Amino acid sequence: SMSPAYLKEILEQLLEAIVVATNPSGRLISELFQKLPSKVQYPDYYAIIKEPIDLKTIAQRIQNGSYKSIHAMAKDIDLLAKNAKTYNEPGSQVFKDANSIKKIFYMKKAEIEHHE
Numbered sequence: 001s002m003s004p005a006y007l008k009e010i011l012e013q014l015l016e017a018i019v020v021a022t023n024p025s026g027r028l029i030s031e032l033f034q035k036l037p038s039k040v041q042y043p044d045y046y047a048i049i050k051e052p053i054d055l056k057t058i059a060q061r062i063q064n065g066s067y068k069s070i071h072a073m074a075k076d077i078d079l080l081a082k083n084a085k086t087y088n089e090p091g092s093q094v095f096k097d098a099n100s101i102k103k104i105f106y107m108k109k110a111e112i113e114h115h116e
């Protein structure tokens with residue numbers, strides 16, 4: 001039974017792993033996922049994506065204590081990737097970066113949860 005304070009530290013470590021991850025070229029794969037697109041300049045996004053989310057919102061939820069489990073933030077990471085893979089075309093760099101973010105999150109989650 002983790003305390004809220006313990007859980008927060010785990011969630012912060014998971015988010016940290018996402019936001020420091022770089023491609024082989026050195027670019028932060030999280031760059032384009034920090035902030036949702038403008039409703040004014042990208043109105044189609046909000047017609048297509050039913051539950052928009054970004055990394056700033058996930059970070060806010062960590063700070064708010066909105067997540068009561070690692071699973072809950074995992075599901076928000078899944079949603080982040082699913083939205084990018086719905087809106088942006090397959091083979092787009094945003095599409096691949098979305099899968100990479102998921103890949104990094106679950107690898108770090110396993111490292112944390114299984115280390116002994």
Ligand SMILES: Cc1cccc([C@@H]2NC(=O)c3c(Cl)cccc3N2)c1
Nearest residue numbers: 032033035036037053054080083084
């Ligand atoms: C118009 C356009 C062009 C290039 C990239 C995006 C990108 N697509 C996302 O789905 C996304 C997610 Cl999930 C979270 C935060 C910002 C995002 N914008 C949007």
Ligand SMILES: [Zn+2]
Nearest residue numbers: 109110113114
């Ligand atoms: Zn396990």
Ligand SMILES: [Zn+2]
Nearest residue numbers: 111114115116
């Ligand atoms: Zn250990």
